[PDB]
Design a protein around this ligand. Structure first.
Ligand SMILES: OC[C@H]1O[C@H](O[C@H]2[C@H](O)[C@@H](O)[C@@H](O)O[C@@H]2CO)[C@H](O)[C@@H](O)[C@@H]1O
Lengths: 251, 380
């Protein structure tokens, strides 16, 4: 429907009213700036039968919500909105943007491994489903906003060497992992700021050299590790020297 | 158009057709309510004259119409098959002598974009008359309202069907919270750029038709308080004297509750906590249940429960986490009763507890929570 060519950063291409009844692909473009704005746009059944096309070009959304974002590394299509279960997207590249735009409460991971190869932000929502999350090429998942990130019942989350979650916000961050967690020789959580973090591991298993570390002097953290399958060698020293504990709950 | 029964009727294909600055009026409204629409969609079975009627997929653009003396200003039905046909009315000038009217926008299985121009009214029947009537609009439909609400108080919306579709898009509400009524809050899907600080409740003298956001016009039941606070970003709820009760599990918004009123969960029901934040009960005459757990938490986000009033969960718990929770509970003065302060349905919930009162179940000071809760801090 729209093709946005080299629209400047200050420009806004506002869309109001009702989208067509039949599915359409909304936007494509060229240039480094998003300018499309959904101003209370009545989307109808576009999430189920249409496509966004290129999510990069959407600058802001007002009054348009969806509860869940669906990801399918095997059958998904990135042209999709991803907010309807029959039309999931396939990559993780824009899940943070998409969830922020539509105020999604959860992310659904269909079977298969959802991977990243460069640092990628994760929205602070509930992740569920049979899929797994993998950070490859030394990349890390990024936590940039306060709130709670929950991994519930996934087939697991792991990395090929980089720290698992890099926190760059000073806001309170809760990380809840109720699935298999494997950071290898790295940390589950690395704070790049003077953080305030609460990490909760529930059953399944966890592996890492330290549960939480920080790049610089002190980051307050609270930790609960409820699983026998953990590196017991760090029960006495679960975090690096740059992290001070508020509480520690480990058997 | 000067008419007796129906002003204008638009049916089936009329793509791109426009009707600008139309002046359509019934010749007076005497016995208007008794006219019977002749050409109308199946879903419209009400009696009364209709200035403008549209259905079967017709989508004529109505720009600045002037509609006078009608029982129904507009009756519009989307196409039966897929709800196709947007109801488009921009700045309608609606008036009727003696404030006689049934509905301005009777919308069936459809979407709409309407811009109000600070002109309009709702009829003399305190129960049935409303600006909008939304009949079986589907889940995917949106009936958007922009512009200025009438100066005089009106009842905004009523409807039938299982899905809310009304949207307040930066609607200028004027003094409607104080003098008007929402009608049926259920049909409002969302609200943008319209806020109110407090939601007022009075279990005996309140009226559910009211918005509830102005102190002179509180609502009555607790059923939709979470939804209302969410739509209007309320910071607090004011409970006037009396017992506000629930008999089914009902969500409580995470805001400050104040006033001399009390909260009661009956029929074994529980109050629900579905979002993170802080729920504060400050100075209420108390909160209690007839046997159900007081607060059932179903969110994994950080939840703070601050009770500065009398609390009685009986043999039940003040808080029950239905997920792997993260809760902080603080009881300040007054009194607290329960078998355990916090419990959970399964796999460990973390919590911090502060109980500052001599009137508490002293025998659980050493074991304040059930086996599925692990304490971060305990101050008693
Ligand atoms: O699907 C087309 C249309 O058929 C019927 O409409 C009737 C209408 O009710 C009568 O008042 C008269 O105008 O004849 C029409 C058909 O010839 C359905 O009642 C209506 O819902 C539907 O849209």
């Amino acid at each position: 429907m729209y093709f946005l060519k080299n629209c400047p950063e200050t420009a806004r291409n506002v869309v109001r009213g009702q989208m067509p009844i039949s599915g359409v692909k909304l936007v494509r473009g060229t240039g480094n700036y998003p300018t499309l704005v959904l101003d209370c746009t009545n989307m109808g059944s576009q999430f189920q039968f249409g496509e966004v096309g290129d999510i990069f070009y959407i600058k802001d959304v007002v009054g348009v919500k969806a509860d869940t974002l669906y990801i399918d590394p095997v059958n998904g299509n990135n042209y999709n909105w991803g907010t309807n279960g029959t039309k999931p997207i396939r990559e993780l590249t824009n899940i943070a943007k998409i969830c922020q735009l539509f105020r999604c409460k959860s992310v659904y991971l269909n079977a298969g491994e959802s991977v990243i190869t460069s640092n990628t932000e994760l929205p602070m929502v509930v992740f569920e489903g049979p899929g797994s999350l993998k950070a490859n090429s030394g990349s890390s998942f990024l936590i940039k906003a306060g709130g709670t990130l929950s991994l519930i019942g996934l087939s697991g989350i792991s990395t090929d060497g980089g720290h698992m979650f890099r926190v760059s916000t000073v806001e309170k961050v809760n990380i809840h992992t109720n699935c298999s967690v494997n950071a290898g020789a790295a940390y589950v959580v690395l704070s790049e700021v003077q953080g305030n973090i609460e990490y909760r591991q529930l059953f399944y298993s966890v592996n890492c050299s330290k549960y939480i570390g920080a790049t610089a002097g002190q980051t307050i953290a609270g930790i609960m590790v409820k699983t026998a399958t953990r590196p017991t060698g760090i029960d006495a020293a679960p975090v690096d020297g740059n992290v001070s504990l508020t509480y520690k709950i480990i058997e | 158009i000067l008419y007796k029964t129906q002003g204008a009727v638009f049916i089936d294909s009329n793509g791109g057709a426009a009707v600008n600055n139309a002046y359509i009026s019934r010749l007076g409204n005497t016995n208007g309510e008794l006219e019977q629409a002749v050409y109308k969609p199946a879903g419209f079975t009400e009696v009364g004259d209709v200035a403008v009627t549209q259905f079967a997929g017709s989508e004529v653009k109505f720009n600045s119409p002037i509609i006078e003396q009608a029982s129904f200003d507009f009756v519009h039905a989307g196409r039966d098959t897929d709800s196709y046909g947007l109801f488009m009315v921009d700045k309608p000038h609606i008036e009727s002598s003696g404030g006689k009217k049934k509905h301005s926008f009777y919308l069936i299985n459809t979407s709409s974009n309407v811009t109000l121009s600070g002109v309009g009214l709702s009829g003399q029947d305190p129960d049935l008359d409303s600006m909008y009537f939304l009949k079986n609009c589907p889940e995917t439909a949106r009936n958007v309202v922009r512009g200025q609400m009438p100066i005089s108080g009106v009842k905004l919306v009523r409807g039938t069907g299982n899905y809310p579709t009304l949207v307040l898009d930066c609607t200028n509400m004027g003094s409607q919270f104080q003098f008007g009524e929402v009608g049926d809050i259920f049909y409002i899907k969302d609200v943008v750029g319209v806020k109110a600080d407090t939601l007022y409740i009075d279990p005996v003298n309140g009226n559910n038709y009211n918005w509830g956001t102005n102190g002179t016009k509180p609502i009555r039941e607790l059923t939709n308080i979470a939804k209302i606070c969410q739509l209007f970003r309320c910071k607090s709820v004011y409970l006037n004297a009396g017992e506000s009760v629930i008999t089914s599990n009902t969500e409580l918004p995470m805001v400050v509750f104040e006033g001399p009123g009390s909260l009661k969960a009956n029929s074994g029901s529980s109050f629900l906590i579905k979002a993170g934040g802080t729920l504060s009960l400050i100075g209420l005459s108390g909160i209690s249940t007839d046997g159900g757990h007081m607060f059932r938490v179903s969110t994994v986000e950080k939840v703070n429960i601050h009770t500065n009033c009398s609390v009685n969960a009986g043999a039940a718990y003040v808080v029950l986490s239905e997920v792997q929770g993260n809760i902080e509970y603080r009881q300040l003065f007054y009194s607290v009763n329960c078998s355990k302060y916090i419990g959970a349905t399964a796999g460990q919930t973390i919590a911090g507890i502060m109980v500052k009162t001599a009137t508490r179940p002293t025998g659980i000071d050493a074991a304040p929570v059930d086996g599925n809760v692990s304490l971060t801090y305990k101050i008693i």
